[PDB]
Amino acid sequence: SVQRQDLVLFSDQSVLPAHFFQDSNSHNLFFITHQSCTQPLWMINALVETHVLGSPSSLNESSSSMLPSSTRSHAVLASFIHEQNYFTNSLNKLKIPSNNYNVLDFLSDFIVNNIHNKPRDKILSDVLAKFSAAIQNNPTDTIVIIEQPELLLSLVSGLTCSELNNKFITPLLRQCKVLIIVSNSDIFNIDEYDASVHSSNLQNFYKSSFIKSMINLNLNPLKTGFAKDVTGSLHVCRGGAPIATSNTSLHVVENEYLYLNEKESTKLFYR
Amino acid sequence: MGSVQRQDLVLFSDQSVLPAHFFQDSNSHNLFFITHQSCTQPLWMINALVETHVLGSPSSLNESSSSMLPSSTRSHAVLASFIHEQNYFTNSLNKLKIPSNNYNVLDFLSDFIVNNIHNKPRDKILSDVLAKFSAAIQNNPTDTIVIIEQPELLLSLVSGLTCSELNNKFITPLLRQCKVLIIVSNSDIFNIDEYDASVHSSNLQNFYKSSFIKSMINLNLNPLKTGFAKDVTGSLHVCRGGAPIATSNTSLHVVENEYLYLNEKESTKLFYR
Amino acid sequence: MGLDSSHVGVRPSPATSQPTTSTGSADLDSILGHMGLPLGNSVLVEEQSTTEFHSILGKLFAAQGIVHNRISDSSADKTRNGDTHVIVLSLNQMFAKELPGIYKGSEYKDYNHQFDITTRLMPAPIASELTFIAPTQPVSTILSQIEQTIKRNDKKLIRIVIPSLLHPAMYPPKMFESSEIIGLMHGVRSLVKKYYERVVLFASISIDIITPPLLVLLRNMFDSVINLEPFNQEMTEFLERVYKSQPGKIQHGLVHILKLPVFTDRGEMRVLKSEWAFKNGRKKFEIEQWGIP
Amino acid sequence: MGLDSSHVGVRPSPATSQPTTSTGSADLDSILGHMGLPLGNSVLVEEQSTTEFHSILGKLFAAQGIVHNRISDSSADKTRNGDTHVIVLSLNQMFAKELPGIYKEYKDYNHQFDITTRLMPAPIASELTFIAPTQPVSTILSQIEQTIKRNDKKLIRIVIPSLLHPAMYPPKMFESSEIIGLMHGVRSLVKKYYERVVLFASISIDIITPPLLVLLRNMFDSVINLEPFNQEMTEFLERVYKSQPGKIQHGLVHILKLPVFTDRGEMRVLKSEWAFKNGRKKFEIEQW
Amino acid sequence: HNPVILLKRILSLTESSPFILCLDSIAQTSYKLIQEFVHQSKSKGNEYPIVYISFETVNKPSYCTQFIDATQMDFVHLVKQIISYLPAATATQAKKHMVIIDSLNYISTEYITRFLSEIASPHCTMVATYHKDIKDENRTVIPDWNNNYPDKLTLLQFMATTIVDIDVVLTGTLDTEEVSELLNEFRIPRGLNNDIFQLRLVNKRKSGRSLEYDFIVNSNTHEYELLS
Amino acid sequence: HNPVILLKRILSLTESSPFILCLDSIAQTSYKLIQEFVHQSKSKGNEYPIVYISFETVNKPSYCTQFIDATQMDFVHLVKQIISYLPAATATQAKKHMVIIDSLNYISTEYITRFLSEIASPHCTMVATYHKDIKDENRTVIPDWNNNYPDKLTLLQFMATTIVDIDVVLTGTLDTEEVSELLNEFRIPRGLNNDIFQLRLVNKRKSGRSLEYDFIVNSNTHEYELL
């Protein structure tokens, strides 16, 4: 049949090269966008596994030697749609130690304790303080993953995209090394209807984030007829901002992978 | 096909421009809708209507069969406009030897903003305008037609004005106290090239739609869509309105037709194809 | 601790091997792939045209919960412990009196019963068994009442039924604001996730008057969605042309599957369009494999 | 009420026998049809480009009035008289210092000007006055009315240069009500003292929404459209008139709304028939 | 069942559908349909009382019994007036009433549902007209970025029981497309508002899918026929 | 005449145009053009100071001389801070200044002119960029029909001396319509945002009609060819 392949991102054949952390005052962003029918659990899990264990052993079927890591290296995960336990259950199948990842809950008791009888500035300041307290204690090696922040625009009323960027996203990115944004692109995929001006304050956030990004990953279903042999198609493409690195020869490689999901296993192959 | 001979003006079934039946009754209000572009001002229309109501018959355009008055010599007209002045109407009417006591003019241009709009609310100004209009009707009894030209400019004058507000406090209350009303308006807003203003400036077009719906007859003057020589000025179309005629004669109806008019120095003609 | 394993209405799933409960319709559970709704999740059954097929599903849910509580009350010769309490967010007070009765006409048992539309459930549910929450009160107050009602029933299975979500005659225009509806749904999802060992959620909506942005937001918020489409004119006429000889072989429309339970959460594309049909019989509502004539 | 009977700057119109005044360029007075702009009327001139040609037209308009005023020599008590007071609605007061000077049947009704020269001596405050367009509309109307009332029988020339410029007009005045009310009040005033007051204005249409454009066009009495050519037309004209450096026309002139001729029910549209040229001594318009 | 029979039955108001909607453009107005309605009601002999609401009407109709000038008078007192002129809350042997509203374009969206709920009653049925060409105002006050509330037309189409669409029939040599362009640029042609027009009828079945039909109606002969 | 000479002159800040506008999208950003500008200016002795205003970027460029975070302070403090870093109405002829704005899509429309009425100076060159996809915010100006102010893009284009438009050169087996429809679905293809790109240059003069020239620029070899 088809030939199994291995995931690669940059020219040095390293998915998440560690020098990004050694360089001081060089913040970087990742933008993972997906549709509602192509949920990116495996992508996030493989990314965290690569950062901690030093290799994406889940996908590349252990076809490569281990890269030194796990020395106090940490990760912070927060989400506005899954609270704490979903991440824990997903993670506790790859033997990741519990002392290396910290999960923030932004789903339970959020509305009661955050929105009612509080102005918007207070909300944003408190969420920023919660993020800062967590990031403070692990300043050496810590990638920050956050999933669907634009949902906030719905809960808060009178909150605009520019205000969200000014008061939440940019200050958080300024105090981090690698910040990763997980987003759902259902808005752009409504058949027989246009939302270009009918819903623009939502697409503005996506476009701005893509502008401030350096590498883009797209999870889409098949445009052609259904093929049970493969789930969707993952595209890796150049972002919108230069890489804040020192190796001038380090450049992203654009390509695509036909990926098939199974009972907790993803198969990657071109075609 | 190609009739250079000028043709007389006919509107209704009884071959009359303006029957008197709209006066020998109570509660029979009616509304004419005249639409013009910026290219073709309807001065001769207003003059012909006024002379028909007062003198007794149109003469500037018709054969001048020289019929008698439809009513008493008292027959009166009231003219007001938000775009023109008193002298304009006075000089236009005095060209036809119209008696000075057979018409009245209300000036809605002189010192309007400095004495009416500034430091006053919307209800106050609308009430004052309505009172000023109603004074003229209360001055003299029936057989007193009222003509108002370009009233929609209030939408661009008063801040935050709406078509629903204007109709519900100015147009309809004034129509309730009148016998025959004529609305003369400019419809250039619909002819902006390659720009569907209906989705942007919908408030303005709402007024025109609503006025046409309440109308019983429509007269539209337009330049030729296909360019021709200087042998014609424009085309006039007569169409039935969106409301039934307030009349007792069930046999009456409005004749639908089109004419072409050419206008030269202080005189316009009217002919068929 | 969660629900006691002695409970009868909950069965571990084949795949996830986690607690699961049936919806009262065997076909609906079979379509879901888990043969039931696993505890800690939700489901949305949106509808096309003004038709009102979803009220049957809501009543079936409520009746199944009530029947489980009733057999728990009976507990024939044993200690079954099939406790269940149902909370419905609506204002249609007659809904409680419109639940269909059991069917008494002519492996794991006692899981899913058989219901009859024509019959009526008796006696009427008591106040302690079933409560209603006004959908016009403030969001914070409603969330507080839901939390208190969840806390009071420490060891009872809870079903949260939201019948006819977002109906213009049912909610004021203020509730149509994005903030209010989205915050209410977020709070309900949080509450379901918190006591994931006892609570399940069901709701339905008519998409005829819903703007596509709100539709996609709701689809994202929930856990699973099923789309119901009735047939068109030529379809029905052609089917009646060759099927009126057997008046019991005509469906009402199609069933579409977009979001499934945890299957699609981990990254499986299972969207099936126009491959299932639903038929509402005189006493039962069934779902079968659609086949084009 | 009234002006001097034998005013040197007022002549009866040919086709209407009405008082008339020249706009500074005889070509504009010819294209109008009334041998000038009759008193009690106004003209609006547009330009669909980023350039500026209407500026020199306004400068000529003001200069003609100041010259007619200028016939007041120390040999005064002349039979002739040209009493003129100019009102300009703008903020750039340097414009007054840029008025071109003189180049060197009815007599002295129209003069020829040269763009290069200036106007020595410079005009004084008692003749040309300025009004700041950054004040409430009521204040501006009050000031204009006060100025008109103060002068007894002097012919007033009113010119509005560079209407609706973002760097010149605050965004608040861009509300439809304010600008439309200002134009309505100015029209009311110019129709009140119809025997004396004249109004001139110019605008650029590339930044104006079509609704406001049609409203402003309706509010005025005559509209002239100026459109320059594109690159290909310029190159073709350069190639054709290589040996003729005086026959290169910059753009066209469009006639859409005219004086009283139009208001009495006539057709007066003419598209792509006249070509203009900004000559060193005259704004020459000719057949295209 | 022949559709003509159903159309005659609903025109006679023998049916118990509480809400009826009429949609018109400037090409074909609606008062002819009200004339047909009242003629059918009188023909059956069931002279139900008729109540008229005045928004865009100045001439009092002949058949109407009560006239309500709601233009200059606010919403709450309007509802009070309708309730006062309506029959009792409950009376088994009370005669059915008829309510006609000239235009529904003058009521804000945030009041339509409440008004419809409050005026509705088993004793009386309401017929109404909505002008398709008129566009409401949405810039009076802007809530959060989108209020998500549906438009007026969709709301009434959802909350109605029978939908009536009135269209013009062309007898000249002008295509429908050029007619639409002429109307859009407001150059009214000849051959509009004829006495013979086309109707689209939609009836909401009690259990499930609705039924739709097309017809050609002449206002002189009162003879409705079905167009294939 | 050779437009390449004009492009090199305008890039090298030899001209006197006090405002430069760049137009971008999500297909091709505009920081490469800024790097080209600074490289050309430095390569010909025009080593002017550069002042940077931050709305989006957080990594300060190496060539930047002053970095100010405008994402927090409001309008009056921002304009005062920018002014304090400039000569005051009597600028010396020793050297020029070059203020760069990372994105103009965040200032309220009504203030734009007033902003441009202050930071403008004879010794400055405001080089700013505008995102063609990021639609403006309606919270600022009242949506009433009375408000007839023009949109941001048209106002800036009318008030700018030189207009630069950046377009992406396609290389793969796709077409412009296919790329556009993919972008509207947010299915980003490969090959976009490369180093070789088209250009559009509009120069306006106070004595005649403006002119347009289209170039092809290679950001690696600094080659500007004529299309």
Author numbering:
A (entry chain F): 3 to 273
B (entry chain C): 1 to 273
C (entry chain D): 66 to 171, 233 to 419
D (entry chain A): 66 to 169, 233 to 416
E (entry chain E): 6 to 233
F (entry chain B): 6 to 232
Sentences from the paper on this structure:
In eukaryotes, wobble uridines are modified by Elongator, a large and highly conserved macromolecular complex. Elongator consists of two subcomplexes, namely Elp123 containing the enzymatically active Elp3 subunit and the associated Elp456 hetero-hexamer. The Elongator complex harbors two copies of each of its six subunits, namely Elongator proteins 1–6 (Elp1–Elp6). Decreased levels of wobble uridine modifications lead to ribosome pausing, incorrect protein folding and consequently trigger intracellular protein aggregation and proteotoxic stress.
As we observed unbound ring-shaped Elp456 particles in one of our datasets, we also determined the cryo-EM structure of free full-length ScElp456 at 3.7 Å overall resolution. The newly obtained structures of full-length Elp456 are almost identical to the truncated crystal structure of the Elp456 subcomplex. The structure confirms that Elp456 contains two copies of Elp4, Elp5 and Elp6, forming a symmetric dimer of trimers. However, the N- and C-terminal extensions of Elp4 and Elp5 (including a small predicted domain at the C-terminus of Elp5 (85)) remain flexible also in the fully assembled complex.
